[PDB]
Amino acid sequence: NLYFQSHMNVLVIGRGGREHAIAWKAAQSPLVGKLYVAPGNPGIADVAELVHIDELDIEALVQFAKQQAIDLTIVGPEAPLASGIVDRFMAEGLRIFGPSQRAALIEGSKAFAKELMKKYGIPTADHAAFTSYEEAKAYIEQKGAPIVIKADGKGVTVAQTVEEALAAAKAALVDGQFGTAGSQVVIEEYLEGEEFSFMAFVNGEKVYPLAIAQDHKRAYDGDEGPNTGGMGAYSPVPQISDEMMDAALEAILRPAAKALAAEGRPFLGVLYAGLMATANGPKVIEFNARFGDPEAQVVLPRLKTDLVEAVLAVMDGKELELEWTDEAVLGVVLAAKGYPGAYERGAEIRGLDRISPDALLFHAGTKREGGAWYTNGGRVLLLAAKGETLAKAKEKAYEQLAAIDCDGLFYRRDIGRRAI
Ligand SMILES: Nc1ncnc2c1ncn2[C@@H]1O[C@H](COP(=O)(O)O)[C@@H](O)[C@H]1O
Fold first, then answer.
1. Helix (H) or strand (E) segment spanning residue 409
2. Cα separation of 362 and 52, whole Å?
3. How far is the CA of 309 from the centre of ligand 1 (A)?
4. Mutational test site, ligand 1, from 78, 284, 285, max ligand atoms within 8 Å of CB
5. How many separate domains does the chain show?
6. Does some domain include residue 114?
7. What separation in Å is there between the alpha carbon of 285 and the centre of ligand 1?
8. Is 49 in the pocket of ligand 1 (CB under 6 A)?
9. Where is the ATP-grasp domain (predicted)?
10. 125 in ligand 1 pocket by Cβ < 6 Å?
11. Does 126 sit in the ligand 1 pocket, CB within 6 Å?
12. CB 196 within 8 A of CB 235
């Protein structure tokens, strides 16, 4: 219904699966003439031209963007946002979809986020930091247990009793790292319920919600092992009621966007809320200032609305209702053995040519050499599949995953298990 100039030159900043998903979606826009990804990866080269410039080499990206007359730049990773890529681009008159350094702090500093949510009455887990044991003790005795104790320098304890919490807190301050302000201990309210990711396009106070998704951050099946950037995800999320979703939109997302704007930090881009559906309603775990990975890989394929058109509409503050397919999407991450810890690179990946054309294969950390594929990163690939139902999406995804053979990769087999 909306009109925007065609034959656009578009630049996507990043190198992972999230960027491959963004590029893939952008390439299908009738408004795009030329698509570039910096620095991208071998898999992304199949849908866009790679630009050999680091995401943090801001001065070069600015020059490149002006040189190639880029009409729109989309930032994937948070690093360049935290570095002020948006600020520099805007000063050069370059259109870019992403938050300013000041607004991106919502993700950069968990303390800032907690500070903001407390001031504006946004539901979230209680949070407090201490350098004094006596002060930590008094606080712990007020909140009770179970409670979370976090030491700096492994260091996270979910204390089941107040006594254990005190022992852990004392240990954190005694054995924790000695910073320039001494040792410190972080205490947080332990929340229970179903976790879900709620992303939305934002521009000032205007919020445009995206479909919600559920990511499994634990490294191993049965949600065991250390936390990761995400080992799998799916959308929609049946177990999250529409009421929980709406409460999240009206009591969390809209208020956060208004809070940032009220604080002189208007946000533009994708505001990603990591939430917990508790019995008392939705509560924020953390905020991210851009597309989540692997959330983007399973949510963007469900978006029927043209992505580029949507982004431009948001940037112009125009009205827009996003449309989504009824079909579900589930994705599974293939990671290098050892990840999220130390992992090896260089294992050959066979079978990428055996996967169905309907399967969505997003490259993270792959490398092409001598006509073959090799692992080259923590998270290497993500394979997603569409399905009439979540169960169908899950079956198709895992069915296709078996076609891949690599002794240097592993992947959870329980993605979507509980949901179904
Ligand atoms: N206050 C909390 N209550 C329950 N779980 C939490 C809390 N904070 C963090 N987590 C878990 O830790 C994971 C990663 O958050 P983080 O360790 O801060 O990077 C989340 O996906 C949650 O499952």
1. strand 409-410
2. 19
3. 34
4. 285
5. 4
6. no
7. 6
8. no
9. 114-316
10. yes
11. no
12. no
Q: CB of 128 closer than 6 A to ligand 1?
A: no
Measured CA to CA, the distance from residue 56 to residue 72 in angstroms comes to 18
Q: Using CA positions, which residue lies closest to atom 22 of ligand 1?
A: 285
| Residue of 310, 304, 301 whose CA lies nearest to 331 | 301
Residue 22, sorted as left (phi over 0), alpha (psi -120 to 50) or beta, turns out to be alpha
**Residue 145's domain spans which residues?**
126-191
- For 283, other C-beta atoms within 10 Å of its C-beta total 21
CA distance 46 to 27: 10
Pocket lining: 113 vs ligand 1, CB cutoff 6 Å: no
188 lines ligand 1 (CB under 6 A): yes
Method: X-ray
| In the block, residue with structure tokens 């199949």 | 46
- Mark whether 291 and 234 lie in a shared domain: yes
Same domain, 392 and 379: yes
The per-residue DSSP string of 144-205 comes to -SSEEEEE----EEEESSHHHHHHHHHHHHHHS--BBTB--EEEEE---SEEEEEEEEEETT
Write b or e for each residue in 183-213: b if 16 or more Cβ atoms lie within 10 A of its Cβ, otherwise e: bbbbbbeebebbbbbbbbbbbebbbbbbbbb
Q: What is the resolution of this structure in A?
A: 1.9
Binding residues: 189, 191, 195
3-state class (DSSP) for residue 139: helix
Q: Whose CA is nearest to atom 9 of ligand 1?
A: 285
Look at residue 157 and tell me if it is in a domain.
yes
Separation of alpha carbons 257 and 249, rounded Å: 11
The answer to whether the CB of 148 is under 6 A from ligand 1 is yes
Whole-number Å distance between alpha carbons of 291 and 14: 11
Alpha helices in 316-409 (DSSP H): 390-401
| Furthest C-alpha separation in the chain | 65
Question: Which residue among 44, 65, 100 closes a domain?
Answer: 100
